[PDB]
Scaffold this active site. Sequence first.
Site, PDB file in Angstrom:
ATOM      1  CB  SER A 150      -1.021  -0.005   1.075  1.00  0.00           C
ATOM      2  OG  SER A 150      -2.002   0.947   0.777  1.00  0.00           O
ATOM      3  CG  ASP A 229      -7.597  -3.653  -0.611  1.00  0.00           C
ATOM      4  OD1 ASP A 229      -8.012  -2.642   0.034  1.00  0.00           O
ATOM      5  OD2 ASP A 229      -6.370  -3.902  -0.742  1.00  0.00           O
ATOM      6  CG  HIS A 262      -5.233  -3.058   2.458  1.00  0.00           C
ATOM      7  ND1 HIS A 262      -4.921  -2.644   1.181  1.00  0.00           N
ATOM      8  CD2 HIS A 262      -4.430  -2.352   3.289  1.00  0.00           C
ATOM      9  CE1 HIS A 262      -3.968  -1.729   1.237  1.00  0.00           C
ATOM     10  NE2 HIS A 262      -3.649  -1.539   2.505  1.00  0.00           N
TER      11      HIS A 262
END
Length: 283
Positions: A150, A229, A262
Amino acid sequence: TDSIKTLSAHRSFGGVQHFHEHASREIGLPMRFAAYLPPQAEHGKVPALLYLAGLTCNEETFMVKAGAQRLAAELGIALIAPDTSPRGAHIDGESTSWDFGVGAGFYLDATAAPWAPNWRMESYLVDELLPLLAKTLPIDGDRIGVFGHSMGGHGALTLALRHPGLFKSLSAFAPICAPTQCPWGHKAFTGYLGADTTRWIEHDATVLMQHQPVAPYPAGILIDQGLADKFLAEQLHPHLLEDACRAIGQPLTLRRHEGYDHGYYFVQSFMADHLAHHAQILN
């Protein structure tokens, strides 16, 4: 040539897992980073993989949850996990939001105050931590790849692109690919760089990839993305990096995975695929 402080050391798949502290002069404060040394590092200098963690993460996240030690020992690669921000700066508002400040350096150098003195994560990694890794650890400094998750996938992408030749390989899990086009990026860029947009665009993986003169990673870039996600629609926008690498002929395997989210149960599930991808280029 140099020493550096050891906080703890643990035996790990025949190799050694280390946690280190040092006095950083790019950041001006103590910094923590972790380092996994495989069993092959007692006979020679191994290639290392730098892993950049995302928002709310430290230098311990990846070493505890990714499960990358097992494959690193089998492939003979060192793992380096730095922190995601400076700690102990005591700046007002550095911890009011988890998307900004502490645990959210965005792998860049802030120009604006109060952040500019200590929020220099890009210079810290490139001009301090990576050289210092060759001086103190059994690493081949010229065989380092980079990957991350991320905020750290944004960091692996933008650092790889802005320092050509520094990283031989490149992966990401659910990267922020177009930080100029997402709330996380707008807030962090405004905070750290202000409003100019030229400094913003030189920190955007999608913008930078669009203007490469040639494919920067002819061996290819691997990116895994979960479809369950929470932040994909708002924050990651991997379609835009797909269009940027198509435009210039950059090979990319962006894989979408139903059901995965995620977090680190996702990261673990594809860790083997990334370690193989990097080991094959760096070895």
